[PDB]
From a paper:
The cluster of differentiation 47 (CD47) protein, expressed on both healthy and cancer cells, plays a pivotal role in this balance by delivering a “do not eat me signal” upon binding to the signal-regulatory protein alpha (SIRPα) receptor on myeloid cells. As a cell surface glycoprotein molecule, CD47 belongs to the immunoglobulin superfamily and binds to various proteins, including integrin, thrombospondin-1 and SIRPα. SIRPα (also known as PTPNS1, SHPS1, CD172A and P84), which can bind to CD47, contains an extracellular region with three immunoglobulin superfamily (IgSF) domains, including an NH2-terminal ligand-binding V-domain. Blockade of the CD47/SIRPα interaction can inhibit tumor growth by inhibiting the suppressive effects of SIRPα and promoting macrophage activity.
Using a recombinant technology, we were able to make a special recombinant SIRPα-Fc fusion protein named IMM01 with a special SIRPα-Fc structure, which has SIRPα (V2) extracellular segment domain 1 and human IgG1 Fc, with the N-glycosylation modification site of N80A mutation in the D1 region. After Papain digestion, the number of amino acids in the IMM01-Fab is 142 with a molecular weight of 15,241.15, theoretical pI of 7.15 and extinction coefficient of 0.662. The 2.76 Å data were used for the analysis of structure determination. The interface area between chain A (IMM01) and chain C (CD47) is 973.5Å2, which is composed of 29 residues from IMM01 and 27 residues from CD47, including 14 hydrogen bonds and 11 salt bridges. The interface area between chain B (IMM01) and chain D (CD47) is 965.8 Å2, which is composed of 27 residues from IMM01 and 26 residues from CD47, including 14 hydrogen bonds and 10 salt bridges. All the hydrogen bonds that appear in the structure in the literature are also present in the IMM01/CD47 structure. These common hydrogen bonds are stable under different crystal packing styles, suggesting that these hydrogen bonds are important for protein binding. In the structure of human CD47 in complex with human SIRPα, except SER66, the amino acids that form hydrogen bonds are all conserved. At this site between chain A and chain C, there are a salt bridge bond between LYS53 (A) and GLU104 (C) and a salt bridge bond between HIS56 (A) and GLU106 (C) instead. Our data demonstrated the crystal structures of the complex of IMM01 and CD47 on the common hydrogen bonds, the salt bridge interaction and the water-mediated hydrogen bonds.
Numbering used by the authors:
A (entry chain C): 1 to 116
B (entry chain A): 1 to 117
């Protein structure tokens, strides 16, 4: 499998303009982004996907601000960023699933809102 | 670039109840991008037995050193076998998508369970 540097949960307040949910594969050996496929899941739904082969990103309308930095993929960073407006509406357990050729893995991070 | 083969070398495996069953599978290519999963039987109501996702299958363990990019062995070991584990097991390649789609399957391995060694 692909192995992850795991995080139980991440907190955000209104200080956070953009929200970042971390996802770090510890054993990426990818030559190219065309070998890699990312899926971010929330409440059973694919709310972000990146197809390296096609070099295309796909979001549902209620996660329109959701994205990853494709520049950082080869380093093993698949962290999801969305506008705080989207984040407050969608708190809970997020699945980050990475594929590299045939190797496959996932990890879960709870996005928590803290009141200040 | 040879059109992918998914090869289960054993057509059948025989094991005593309580022993472990090594179900063998190897691939000739690692493309297209997408994972290997083990099912028991084929068809719509087929049962998922193993994939590489951590802690989802406590009975099944990777026989291969499958954490390496170079790995093309997807053989698995099913511990504490009982007659309820009997059936045909299939090694199936998938293409990535929403959702993932079956690309290629092996010919299958048929596990049978003796009462005594
Ligand atoms: C919110 O911002 C703080 C810095 O003020 C940062 O440490 C924290 O990780 C951010 N949270 C998220 C979920 O982005
Ligand atoms: C997220 O998952 C953890 C561990 O399974 C669970 O304790 C928690 O209740 C879940 N959170 C939500 C918001 O469902």
């Amino acid at each position: 499998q692909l192995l992850f540097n795991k995080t139980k949960s991440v907190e955000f307040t209104f200080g956070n303009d953009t929200v970042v949910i971390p996802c770090f594969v510890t054993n990426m050996e990818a030559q190219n982004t065309t070998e890699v496929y990312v899926k971010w899941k929330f409440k059973g739904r694919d709310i972000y996907t990146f197809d390296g082969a096609l070099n295309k990103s796909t979001v549902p309308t209620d996660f329109s601000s959701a994205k990853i930095e494709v520049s950082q993929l080869l380093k093993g960073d698949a962290s999801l960023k969305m506008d705080k407006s989207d984040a407050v509406s969608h708190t809970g357990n997020y699945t980050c699933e990475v594929t590299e050729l045939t190797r496959e893995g996932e990890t879960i991070i709870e996005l928590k809102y803290r009141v200040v | 670039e040879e059109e992918l083969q998914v090869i289960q070398p054993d057509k059948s495996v025989s094991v005593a109840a309580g022993e472990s069953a090594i179900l063998h599978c190897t691939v000739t290519s690692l493309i297209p991008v997408g994972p290997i999963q083990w099912f028991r039987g084929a068809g719509p109501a087929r049962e998922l037995i193993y994939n590489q996702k951590e802690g989802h299958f406590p009975r099944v363990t990777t026989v291969s050193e499958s954490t390496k990019r170079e790995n093309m062995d997807f053989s698995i070991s099913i511990s504490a076998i009982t007659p309820a584990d009997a059936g045909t097991y299939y090694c199936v390649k998938f293409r990535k998508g929403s959702p993932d789609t079956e690309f290629k399957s092996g010919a299958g391995t048929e596990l049978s369970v003796r009462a005594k060694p």
